[PDB]
Design a protein around this motif. Structure first.
Motif, PDB file in Angstrom:
ATOM      1  N   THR A   5      13.567  51.370  25.192  1.00  0.00           N
ATOM      2  CA  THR A   5      12.987  51.284  23.855  1.00  0.00           C
ATOM      3  C   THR A   5      11.850  52.299  23.702  1.00  0.00           C
ATOM      4  OG1 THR A   5      13.518  48.925  23.831  1.00  0.00           O
ATOM      5  CG2 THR A   5      12.001  49.725  22.159  1.00  0.00           C
ATOM      6  N   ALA A  45      13.144  48.176  14.244  1.00  0.00           N
ATOM      7  CA  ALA A  45      12.870  49.602  14.129  1.00  0.00           C
ATOM      8  C   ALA A  45      12.465  49.983  12.711  1.00  0.00           C
ATOM      9  CB  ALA A  45      14.097  50.406  14.566  1.00  0.00           C
ATOM     10  N   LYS A  78       7.404  46.158  12.405  1.00  0.00           N
ATOM     11  CA  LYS A  78       8.083  47.125  13.255  1.00  0.00           C
ATOM     12  C   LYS A  78       7.617  46.975  14.698  1.00  0.00           C
ATOM     13  CE  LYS A  78       9.094  50.603   9.776  1.00  0.00           C
ATOM     14  NZ  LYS A  78       9.574  52.010   9.736  1.00  0.00           N
ATOM     15  N   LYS A  79       8.493  47.360  15.625  1.00  0.00           N
ATOM     16  CA  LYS A  79       8.344  47.297  17.079  1.00  0.00           C
ATOM     17  C   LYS A  79       8.011  45.900  17.592  1.00  0.00           C
ATOM     18  CE  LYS A  79       4.923  50.228  16.916  1.00  0.00           C
ATOM     19  NZ  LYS A  79       3.949  51.281  17.307  1.00  0.00           N
ATOM     20  N   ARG A  80       8.244  44.853  16.806  1.00  0.00           N
ATOM     21  CA  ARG A  80       8.002  43.495  17.271  1.00  0.00           C
ATOM     22  C   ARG A  80       9.227  42.937  17.988  1.00  0.00           C
ATOM     23  NH1 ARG A  80       4.172  39.721  16.066  1.00  0.00           N
ATOM     24  NH2 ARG A  80       3.409  40.975  14.312  1.00  0.00           N
ATOM     25  N   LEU A  90       8.831  52.673  23.097  1.00  0.00           N
ATOM     26  CA  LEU A  90       7.572  51.961  22.941  1.00  0.00           C
ATOM     27  C   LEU A  90       6.609  52.326  24.060  1.00  0.00           C
ATOM     28  CD1 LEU A  90       8.443  48.350  21.721  1.00  0.00           C
ATOM     29  CD2 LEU A  90       7.752  50.379  20.434  1.00  0.00           C
ATOM     30  N   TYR A 112       7.589  53.813  14.432  1.00  0.00           N
ATOM     31  CA  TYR A 112       8.460  53.346  15.505  1.00  0.00           C
ATOM     32  C   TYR A 112       9.028  54.489  16.335  1.00  0.00           C
ATOM     33  CZ  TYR A 112      12.081  50.872  18.019  1.00  0.00           C
ATOM     34  OH  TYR A 112      12.873  50.352  19.012  1.00  0.00           O
ATOM     35  N   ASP A 157      16.704  47.905  17.081  1.00  0.00           N
ATOM     36  CA  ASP A 157      17.029  48.567  18.335  1.00  0.00           C
ATOM     37  C   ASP A 157      17.357  47.524  19.392  1.00  0.00           C
ATOM     38  OD1 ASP A 157      17.491  50.743  19.923  1.00  0.00           O
ATOM     39  OD2 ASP A 157      15.475  51.584  19.727  1.00  0.00           O
ATOM     40  N   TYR A 174      14.379  44.839  19.030  1.00  0.00           N
ATOM     41  CA  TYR A 174      13.084  45.287  18.535  1.00  0.00           C
ATOM     42  C   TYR A 174      13.249  45.894  17.150  1.00  0.00           C
ATOM     43  CZ  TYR A 174      11.831  44.571  23.364  1.00  0.00           C
ATOM     44  OH  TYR A 174      11.633  44.009  24.602  1.00  0.00           O
TER      45      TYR A 174
END
Lengths: 356, 62
Positions: free
Chosen positions: A159, A40, A298-300, A161, A280, A69, A38
């Motif tokens: 993660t 970051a 980010k965070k994808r 998220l 993030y 990450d 992911y």
RNA sequence: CGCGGGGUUAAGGUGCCGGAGUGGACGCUCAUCAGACACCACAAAAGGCGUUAGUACAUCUUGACAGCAGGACGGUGGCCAUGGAAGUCGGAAUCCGCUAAGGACUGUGUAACAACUCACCUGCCGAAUGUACUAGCCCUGAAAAUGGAUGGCGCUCAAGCGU
RNA sequence: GGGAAGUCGGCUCCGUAACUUGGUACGGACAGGGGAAUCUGCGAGAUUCCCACUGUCCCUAUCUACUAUCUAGCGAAACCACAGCCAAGGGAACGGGCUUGGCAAAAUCAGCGGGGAAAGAA
RNA sequence: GGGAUAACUGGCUUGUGGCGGCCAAGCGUAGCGACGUCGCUUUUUGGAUGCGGCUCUUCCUAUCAUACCGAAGCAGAAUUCGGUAAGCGUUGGAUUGUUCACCCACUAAUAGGGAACGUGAGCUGGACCGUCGUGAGACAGGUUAGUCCCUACUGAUGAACUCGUCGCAAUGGUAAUUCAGCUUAGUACGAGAGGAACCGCUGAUUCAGAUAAUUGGUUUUUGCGGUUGUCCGACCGGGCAGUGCCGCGAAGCUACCAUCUGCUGGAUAAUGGCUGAACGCCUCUAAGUCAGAAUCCAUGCCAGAACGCGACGAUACUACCCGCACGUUGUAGACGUAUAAGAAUAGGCUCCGGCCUCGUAUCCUAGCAGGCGAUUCCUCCGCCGGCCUCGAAGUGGCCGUCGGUAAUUCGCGUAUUGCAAUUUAGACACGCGCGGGAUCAAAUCCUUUGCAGACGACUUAGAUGUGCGAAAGGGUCCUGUAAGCAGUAGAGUAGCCUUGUUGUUACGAUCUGCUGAGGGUAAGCCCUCCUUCGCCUAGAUUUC
């Protein structure tokens, strides 16, 4: 624009698929091809460059690196494919026992109201002496399949998220007979696999992602202007891309507590910037540090896979000596690596007296 | 300028692949597969040995 | 050329699409977008070491064509010219002997020679050849620019051409 | 306001003494301002940069005018033989319906740059 | 003034002049006549032009460059002519009314054309009458023609196949390009002057796809501070000037103004060869075959057929499986719907004797539409199980039980469907039933999220939790030092009494301290141990 990225459409899936694993031969050792992570953020570094022939040879250069990450992935299945005159066909898949709530969330769409009844009969198939049938499926894979892939899912609950639904994908096993690959996957069942186990430092990889969307955008930005060949207005962004040749500069262990420390900077600090990654959070797991820009916000969700072809350049055979990693704030013009450095620089404060 | 698909360029790439990247990636793969192995090893009909049947068309129905 | 039933034809066709022959006899043609009736044009006394049939002339067991092994000599390095030029940088004549035959030389070559080779001759071989034309079919005999047309598929001892 | 383009653009007078009303010698003054900066200890403070014209072009600024997706309600007109996917062919520079081919799968939303418009001929 | 004609090109067009003589295969029995050669143009000293221009799409090759070849006194370097190639790129200046030529600068080079009578799409820079004249025209004399929808493309949703997860890949698109520097090397080569290349290495142009750590720009963060005019009686704190003005300004967005990445197999063209006939020499070609271009086809790369396919999960009713009762239920069309070597065709098969034009072959083929019994037979079917086998779109073998069975012969029944009338009989599918077994699910709406977004759509969360929401605290960023008070620091403004050599008492810009304080801080920043409060197993629809 290029007539090679047309029909300029939104990506059919958010995860992004590999679409090609490197070709397999039995002579190499048994190994996995791809992994997941992911995005970051990205930061700045300085590398002591050893590019014989370059003007920056034996000099310090400033480079931009993207941080991914990468919590360890869990193996929960094994799929076997056969060759047919119409292509590859998934002959059969055999799962692991004790699937996780996150992969079951992947299977479900409304997880909260559902009776969470996925794979219960399959676990009963393990437990109630239908292991004969399960071994039969493994042996069918052994004796009929030509390529084997392993089902693996990420750990969202590690993660940082808001999401709770994991991501499944098949990572192809290469380098051995089908029996060796089947035994490898069966032994890898219910076990975490790490990014330092799949890849390592100094290795160029390929990154599969979905590049950020911008909605309905006219030709001026959609193609770059002043029949399918004529520039038209429509969706621009949110496009599946496989970006090749990105150098893996570092793999940080997360529990090291000195991830951002080099042999030149003796500062016990981690990769997370001062104040956290913008939008993030903090990276508390294994992380992959790769050169340059990479598709995705980010965070994808991101797919990391091995190169299809053995490399033809000296940039892929080079060692990467790191000098320092920037941990200043990305939330503005930050100039302190650590809160301790900020406090030492600014002295003590009125709230410091009031609290103490 | 020689094209990226020129035959001589392809032959030079083949030699470079076979004489440097080959050995480097072979050693890398040996170490990685060693780590993978470390983590991994960290009646016929009624037993499954005999692979039997589980549970449009190609032929015309008679 | 009224509305209908039955039979037989014309022009055109018989590899379904498409009713009727992958019908019969003798030949010819392989085209890197053949041809399937256009024969007007490009187009000529044109180019073709494609193929078949034919007309005329010529050489042959007095040994034809091709080849291989050998000869290819003497007057004479003929005359003039040139720094040098001997058959072979150039002008003009271009004969005779020995002959089986050999040009005062067809090319390579030397600064000039030398040397090789061709013309021609002999030995070995062994039976049909080789020169120009004519008539078919075939290739070329000029083409631009959206993707397309023997109607389409496709067709090669044809599903092409002639009877 | 800024940038660009072209240029041939940048960088004598007062008093005094003799001479024929005007000249002659002597003495003194003349031959900048504005803005932006840098250096030494406000300082004779020292040093650096820019000042143009144009019937030219572009951009920034101001003003004027038209500029607008969905929902609730209300609510026309233009125009309308029937239709609307292509390529080749259809002797009369004629195709939209025909020949023979490419093909071709309900119902829609948005954008729009193509088609559904044109001659008449000395 | 009358008559005819009223458009016109449309297998058109391109690189090689015309005229006269000589030669001339032939045709012909004088005339037509090519290729050449001679004579003229033409030789014994080195401006033309009188509709243009720009952008974009696509195509052609008649190729300027880049790639590969053949030839040239081609030593080297630089080149010239020619061939295959359209994969990839393809200007400006001067001058002129415009264009071209020439000439001058970059550049790898700075080619030429088509879009079909409207030169693809877009933009831009008159004739009839009347009068007066006629060696000839004039008339402010009159009249007159000036014709918001379907579709393509580009993106976005989508019904039915139960919802979902993971895939495959038919087909369609397709991508990289040029230059430079280092080493080779001052080497090969060269009298000298000069002077390469293959391998290897590193950058840059253009093109393409991304990305935002940094660095600029942008500011409705109207976040903070300054400041103009006016107003809220003044301070403080603020309103108005359609965002008053100024400075900084995160976040987001951007930028070859920033950074990253751009990948390899096969077959070919020109051409160069190997073996070797035609043709007793020879020959790269005829049979056979080797290499070879930036070419061609593919991989890598983008899409995914919404009527192409696969694996797996969970499936409440329904009917999910089984047994068998059927259907006045559907079918581009049962009626023995019987039959697996491979391979060659100038060869093959075999039992190893032999056989092969020939599938007009082999199997099967009798019984009230196929009854009952017997003599006799161990032959052919079938269903279940067991062991195994078959994955290209998944079946068959052996054994075991049980069931049927003319290889021979015979007896009892067939009638009346009346002289033919589909001999309603198979298969797969679907439905409705019975009695046996098994199971007790999801999606949509809704609220929420911003990795998304015109709206749909998409990524998320919502059932007790590592939950969600609102505050708070801490962290990180932005601004730039709050209000108030005090210090004789205080430039200044004034009273007391008398001289002040140090007179006092009040006000007071400005300064300094409390004060990197004060304020803002996710709205698309970060973290929360019980920091505080609250919420929660819902309610509506639909599904084999």
């Amino acid at each position: 624009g290029s007539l090679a990225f047309l029909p300029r459409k939104r990506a059919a899936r958010h995860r992004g698929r590999v679409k090609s694993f490197p070709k397999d031969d039995p002579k190499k050792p048994v190994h996995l091809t791809a992994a997941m992570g992911y995005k970051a953020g990205m930061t700045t570094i300085v590398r002591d460059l050893d590019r014989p022939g370059a003007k920056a040879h034996k000099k310090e250069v400033v480079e931009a690196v993207t941080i991914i990450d990468c919590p360890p992935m869990v193996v929960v299945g094994l799929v076997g494919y056969i060759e047919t005159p119409r292509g590859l066909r998934s002959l059969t898949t055999v799962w692991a026992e004790h699937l996780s709530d996150e992969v079951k969330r992947r299977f479900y769409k409304n997880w909260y109201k559902s009776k969470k009844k996925a794979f219960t009969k399959y676990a009963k198939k393990y437990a109630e002496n239908n292991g004969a049938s399960i071994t039969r499926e493994l042996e069918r894979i052994k004796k009929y399949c030509t390529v084997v892939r392993v089902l693996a899912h990420t750990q969202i609950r590690k993660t940082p998220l808001k999401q709770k639904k994991a991501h499944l994908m098949e990572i192809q096993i290469n380098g051995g007979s089908v029996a060796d690959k089947v035994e490898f996957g069966r032994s890898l069942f219910e076990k975490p696999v790490t990014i330092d186990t799949i890849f390592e430092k100094d290795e160029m990889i390929d990154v599969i992602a979905v590049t950020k969307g911008h909605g309905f955008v006219g030709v001026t930005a959609r193609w770059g202007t002043k029949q399918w060949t004529v520039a038209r207005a429509g969706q621009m962004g949110y496009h599946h891309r496989t970006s090749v040749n990105h150098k893996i500069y570092r793999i940080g262990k997360g529990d090291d507590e000195a991830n951002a420390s080099t042999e030149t900077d003796l500062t016990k600090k981690k990769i997370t910037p001062m104040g956290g990654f913008v939008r993030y959070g903090e990276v508390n797991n294994d992380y992959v540090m790769i050169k340059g820009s990479v598709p995705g916000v980010k965070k994808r969700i991101m797919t990391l896979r091995k190169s299809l072809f053995t490399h033809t350049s000296r940039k892929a055979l080079e060692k990467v000596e790191l000098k320092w990693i920037d941990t200043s704030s990305e939330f503005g013009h930050g100039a302190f690596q650590t809160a301790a450095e900020k406090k030492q620089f600014m002295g003590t404060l009125k709230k410091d007296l009031q609290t103490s | 300028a020689k094209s990226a698909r020129a035959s001589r360029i392809k032959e030079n790439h083949q030699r470079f692949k076979k004489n440097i990247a080959g050995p480097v990636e072979a050693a890398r793969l040996e170490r990685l597969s060693a780590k993978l192995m470390a983590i991994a090893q960290a009646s016929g009909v009624k037993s499954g040995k005999s692979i039997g049947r589980k549970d449009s068309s190609i032929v015309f129905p008679m």
